[PDB]
């Protein structure tokens, strides 16, 4: 398939709350590029924190669902939609580069993630792209993560 | 002014996490009408339990959020932009009714409040309309609500 | 079936979890016709923090849906009895409320009771109306319809 | 000086904020000699999501430190009468807790009552005693002494 | 010495109420030695207190019991999680509590319990909370270990 | 040192996006030493991940960035939290973050960041974090201090 809900996310990703970070699939071409997105509302609780009368989705939170958007389109590439196989599946971060935030995200944004497959071996997924809010580029990332058996 | 982000809305409502539940207005007709919206993201604390392995946004929350939309409608028509009169203000909901359940609302959605004033007499307002997900009405409500001083 | 249920139970037949099982303890349960449970209103609830900063005021709308989980648990054991294993494979939805009524703001410390009769049912549609009250007095009325289904 | 307070008021003495704060209302109090104060326990407070998964207890520490909370009143009270102003300048911090026993679990739909009796004051020094009690029946029991300290 | 999975796997208790992170020593029937960071990325701050930051005094206790009950349960089964899930420990009695120092974000909370005595399935445990080296609290507790229903 | 009441006096973030504990070490326009304290009892471990307790790395970063706006703010203006109210912090740039050891519950957080540029708001940082004496994380990053 091409478009994922939060139910197939749920099945496929080991993160959870507070820390799931793609609500929504839009399109995904194995082995490619994958396009999600997370809603962003006031009603979260990292705006607690960042920042009190001033709430700013944190820059590196965008990262992360890149990241997890990423991880979304490695597992599915390498074993297609397969939750069994999916539930004792972790995600490590081995790197992050060049990344540029170039407009704030606040509550009320779309937060689009765009990835494109930049180079993978195995497990090791090289990914890179952009978070978009309204059609416009919100910030640039690009991320090595590794999918691990967890033991 | 005709549209209003989260630091706008902050200044007038009273509500606070978790129970702020509109995040931006698009559009306000004094005495008329409001349009404004909550985004709806797997990252609330009410997943959690709304349901394990099936998030589904409650509907009385939903009607929570037309009811903060047509306060803010009512202050705003009253006073306009003023976070001083605001700090002096309660809006006391006294009656729902007629509200319906047409589709489930998910993280991934984003909820529109679409609310018209139906009725103002003196301290009175009754106001009602719908909930919107990508044009289509998901929930409908009428609510009728009390201003008084804090 | 019995007709006091505790939180093990609850938890075992509602699919409702923190922080959205309004409902502490059944007190009274007619299978088919009605229902007395109440939950108990604490400062120590997340909900306080913004409802509101230095005047804790417990949601109406968290009311009605507290009367509708009193309604579903009622739903539930009158077609199931007490059997955790089916409960398990369901949820509830909403699909109206009216007639609904706030009188008497409930605050901590407020013990609130739901009382709910069955107005009509049929298969998994439940109709249930009645009152939430604190001490003896009704702090509100509603009316509400709502739906078992397969959680698929 | 009153003798019934709502969470109004334990706001404007206790410095205790969510999810610390484990008062909801004082039904007695008399200066230098007695309160008797409660907390409800509801499902819906985060203590339950670890306290534990399936089996909702209250932790027998919070129900020490709610008594605490309740002798910590007493004792400023005792001093200055309901004064917001003095309050917000003072703290109440326990030296020592002793003869702790627990003897009946707490959980979700309880209303736990603090009674607590002063056995000891000289200053800002405050020696207090009592139980917990749900229905009646001690749940628990606890000696502690607090001492009434600057707050900077 | 064990580390938080290990721990998960003995004691029933979760978030927000797991507060031990590691234990780095433990003599079967004698003592235990283990710890939990302080933070002030923790709930608990938020209102204990506001703009003071102070980890309080009965979570200090709890952390000890729960070091207790790690160290009575490990001394007759030793790490074995599937009869940990058959057995309760609960706590009867806690005194000669003295609180002597503020514990705040940034400590690192030593639990030092020895058994006191024990008896069948009831243990008798007490010891100190320490931070770098000196007693911020003492306490001595009662527990009984039962089957699990 | 600066305790967590100095902290809070200077650094705009709160709860659950305040992650430096202390400071240790600062000597203004070169380095600053911090930690953060790793503990169970922290909200982010429900989802990341259940039944496997990793600080997220991009927090590990949060945490050097923070550690680097104390350093940036107390060279500006010192220790002054009249002016440091009025402002807040935005994430400019990362690059060159790798990943070593997972940090899991348990772990001693330290922050070793040194400045590479600064010009006016806008700081240039990187360094490491390490857990008793090993690094398990690299970094630079840029921040912009704003009214
Ligand atoms: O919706 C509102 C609301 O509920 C309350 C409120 C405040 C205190 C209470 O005790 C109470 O019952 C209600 O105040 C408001 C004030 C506004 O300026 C706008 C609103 O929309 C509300
Ligand atoms: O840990 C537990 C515990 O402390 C108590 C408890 C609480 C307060 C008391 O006064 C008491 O006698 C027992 O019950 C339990 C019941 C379980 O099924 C599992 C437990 O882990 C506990
Ligand atoms: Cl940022
Ligand atoms: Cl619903
Ligand atoms: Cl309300
Ligand atoms: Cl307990
Ligand atoms: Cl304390
Ligand atoms: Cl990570």
Known sequence: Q????????????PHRYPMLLVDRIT????????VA?????????????????????????????????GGFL????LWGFDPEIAKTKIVYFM???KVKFRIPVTPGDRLEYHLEVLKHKGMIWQVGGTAQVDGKV??????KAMIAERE
């Open 37 to 69: 997105y997370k809603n962003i509302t006031f009603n979260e609780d990292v705006f607690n924190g960042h920042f009190p009368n001033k709430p700013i989705f944190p820059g590196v939170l965008i990262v992360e669902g890149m990241a997890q958007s």
């Open 27 to 34: 399109e995904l071409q194995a082995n490619q590029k994958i």
């Open 95 to 97: 790197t992050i580069d």
């Open 74 to 77: 490695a597992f599915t590439s």
């Open 2 to 13: 091409s478009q994922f809900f939060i139910e197939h996310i749920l099945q496929i990703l």
């Open 138 to 143: 919100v910030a640039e990332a690009e991320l």
